[PDB]
Curated annotation (Swiss-Prot), chains A, B, C, D, E, F:
Native source organism of the sequence: Escherichia phage MS2 (Bacteriophage MS2)
Highest taxon, organism lineage: Viruses
Name of the protein in its database record: Capsid protein
InterPro entries on file: Levivir_coat (IPR002703), Phage_RNA-type_capsid (IPR015954)
Keywords annotated in UniProt: Capsid protein, RNA-binding, T=3 icosahedral capsid protein, Translation regulation, Virion
Amino acid sequence: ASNFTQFVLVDNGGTGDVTVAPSNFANGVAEWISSNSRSQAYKVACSVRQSSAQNRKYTIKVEVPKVATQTVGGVELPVAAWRSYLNMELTIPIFATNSDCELIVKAMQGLLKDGNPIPSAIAANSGIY
Amino acid sequence: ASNFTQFVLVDNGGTGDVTVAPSNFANGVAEWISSNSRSQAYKVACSVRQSSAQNRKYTIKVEVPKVATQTVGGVELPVAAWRSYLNMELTIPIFATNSDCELIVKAMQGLLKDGNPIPSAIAANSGIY
Amino acid sequence: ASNFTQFVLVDNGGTGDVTVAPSNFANGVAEWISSNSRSQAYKVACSVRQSSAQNRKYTIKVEVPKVATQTVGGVELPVAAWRSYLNMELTIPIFATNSDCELIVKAMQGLLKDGNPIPSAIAANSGIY
Amino acid sequence: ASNFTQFVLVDNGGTGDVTVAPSNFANGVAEWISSNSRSQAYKVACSVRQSSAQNRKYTIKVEVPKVATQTVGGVELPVAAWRSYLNMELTIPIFATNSDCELIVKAMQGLLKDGNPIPSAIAANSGIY
Amino acid sequence: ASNFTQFVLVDNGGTGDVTVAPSNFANGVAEWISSNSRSQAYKVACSVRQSSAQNRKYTIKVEVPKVATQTVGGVELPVAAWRSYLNMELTIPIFATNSDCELIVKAMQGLLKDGNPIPSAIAANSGIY
Amino acid sequence: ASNFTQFVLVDNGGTGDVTVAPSNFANGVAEWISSNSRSQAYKVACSVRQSSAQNRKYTIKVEVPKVATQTVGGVELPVAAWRSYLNMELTIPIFATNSDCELIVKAMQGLLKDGNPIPSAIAANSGIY
RNA sequence: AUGAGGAUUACCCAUG
RNA sequence: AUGAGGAUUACCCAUG
RNA sequence: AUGAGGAUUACCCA
C-alpha cells in the first residue's frame, strides 16, 4: 500500500465536503490539512510508536475550526475561541493480529456512529442524562 | 429522551454484534459495559467538564478485551488475555454552536471511515507512509 | 520522491514472501515492520550519521523471528520462540562519489550471493572449512 | 569438501570482476584478499563462535579500497586513497534448523537486493526520506 | 504528490545544469544534494516549525561549492576549495491564507529576478549604490 | 552602474504589480518600500559587509503584508498577525569571482522557481512530505 | 495547563 | 526571542 | 573511537 493520501474528512454529501491532503511528514508524523490558512484549517496528524515492551501506541490529533460567524481568511483572536482539539491515543498490545486490529477499528467506528449516545451528546452541546 | 442508552459498539452485521449497555453514572462518569463477566467486558466511559472558563472537555475511554480462559490454581476462570485502550479528549470552545459541534462529529466519523488512511494503518499493523 | 516504502525482505517465489512496511521514522532511525502481530513480526531499522569529519556511517538492523504460539495456563499468545539478530555498520568516506557507492553495494550483494562461501556457511549451520 | 575458496566479490559483468582468494585461516578467522598489491586489495574476513550458551555469532568484515597512486619525493607507491568498512554480526540461536538458516540468508539477500530502500540509499550517498 | 522531489538548482540551460535530489529526511530536515562525492556536493536543506503559537518559520539553507582536487599525503582527493552559504528564515503568521503565501513566494522571485538591484550587486561583487 | 533603483517586487502580469522604490540609505543600508503606510508596505533592505577575513556577507530583509481581509490604510493589530518576515544571509568567500557570484545568483533563482519543492510548500501552507 | 510521557487505563509521571 | 553577531554552516556567540 | 565484547537487540560492557 501507501496510505498517505488525501481523504474526505467531513462528508457533506459530495457538495461542500472537506477534503484534507498530505502536508508534512517531518519526523515520521504524517500531517494533512485543508485548503485554508493554518488558523482556519482542518488539521490531522498521526504517528505510531512502540510505547513499551508490550504495547504499540497511535497518537492521532485533529483540529476543527469554529465555522459559525467565521470570516474567511481573517485574523480571529483569541485562537482558543475558534478551535476545537481532538486528541486520541490508541494502545494496542503486541499480540494483536491484523484481525484483532480490525475489530478495534470497528469498535471506534461504532462509538461515533450517528445516533449513538456519545456523538449525539457532543453534537447537542450536552453530556449524558 | 436520556441519551444514556445502549448501542452496538462492534457491528458484526447482526451476528456477534457487541452491544454495550448503561451500567453506572457514579461520580459523573457515564459507563457502559457488555454482557460479560466484568473481567471479560468491553467498556465505554464518558464524562464532560468545563475544563477552562471558555472550554468544555469530553473524556472518552474504550477498552476492547481479548477474551481467554485461564487455569489459576487448577481452576478455570473467564479472563481477558489483554486489553486494548482508546483514550480521547475533545476540547470544544463555549462559543461553538450546535452546528459547529456537528462538524466536529462529522470530522471524527470521516477520520475513521473505512478505507481512509488512519483506519487502514491500524487494521494492518502499519504506520502512515 | 520517497525510499521509505514497503519492500520484500524474504522473496519466497511470489507466495509466502515476507514484506516489511514503513512503521516509524523517529530521531533519524527509519524502521520497517512486517504485518500481523508485532510480536511475530520481522523488523528492519536503518540510520545514517556523520561518524566523524570524513565519514558517514550507516547502521542497519534486521530481526528474523521464529514464529510460535505460547501457551500458559490455557491462555495462548502469538510469540516469536526466538529471534535471529543481524547488525551491520557501513563506513563510507565523504570522498566517495556515486560510482564508488555503487561498487560498495555490489561488494555487499556479492558477499551474500548464493553459492559464495559466506551465505553457504550460514544456511548450513556451519563455519568455514 | 571446502568452502574456504575463491569467489567473486564484485560482479562486473564478466570483466572487471573483483575476485577474492583465500589467504589465511588463523585462529578461527578466515580471511580472503584480492590479487595484486596487498595495499590496494579488497579484504573479506569471517569467523563464527558460540557467543553464549544458546547463540552462535558470525562476524563478517569487508573492505573496499579506493585505488590510487601515492607520490612522495618522486617515489610513487600503489595505495588505497581511503577504504570503506563493512562490519556485520549475525546472531543465530542453536535451535535454528537448516531451514531457519536459509530463511535468514534470504532475509539478508532481500535487504540488499537492487531497488530496495537500503541498497538504494547507500548507492546514492543518501539516507532514508 | 510528495513535494519531496528533485529539481534543477542551477539552470545552465540544459548543459551542465545542477540538479539536486532528495537525500534525507532524518530529524524533520528535508535534504537534497547533487550527484557528487559528499565533499563536493551542492546541498539544500529545508525545515518548518511552529516557532511561536501564531507563527510558523521556514529555515532554508543552500551550500554552493567551488570544486577542486587536492593532493593530501601525495594522494588526490575530490574536494571543495570553498563554499558559499545561503541561510534564510521566513516567518509567516498562522492567519496567512494560501493566496497570502503565494504573494510571499512572488515577492522572493521578483527580488532575485535578473536585472533587479540585488541580484545585480551580488553578481558584480558590489553593494547597492 | 547605480543599482539603487525602483523595481517590480511582485509581478502580477503588468496589471496590479507591486513596485518598490528607494526610500532610505541611512548607514549604507539601502531600503525600498511600496506606496503604502509603513504598517502595510512591502519593504526590502540590503547591505554588504566583510563579515570576517575570509568572507563578505549580504544581509537581505523583506517584509510582506497579509493582504487577505486587509483594510487599506487601517490600523491593524497585532502587528505580528499581519506581516511575514524574510531574512536572508549570503556568505561569500573572498575568492569568489564575478562568475562564481553569478552562479550563486542562479542557485538562488532555481531554488525559488515556480514548481520547485520549496516555493510550492510555502505557497500551500505546507512542509515537505 | 502542557507532553508523538508510561499504565496493570477515571491511574501514575514530568514540566509549567 | 532578538542581532546589517561569527562559522569550518542544522553549529557557536551575545543580549533578553 | 576500538573490541571474531554480550544482549531480552537503536540496550549493556571493557
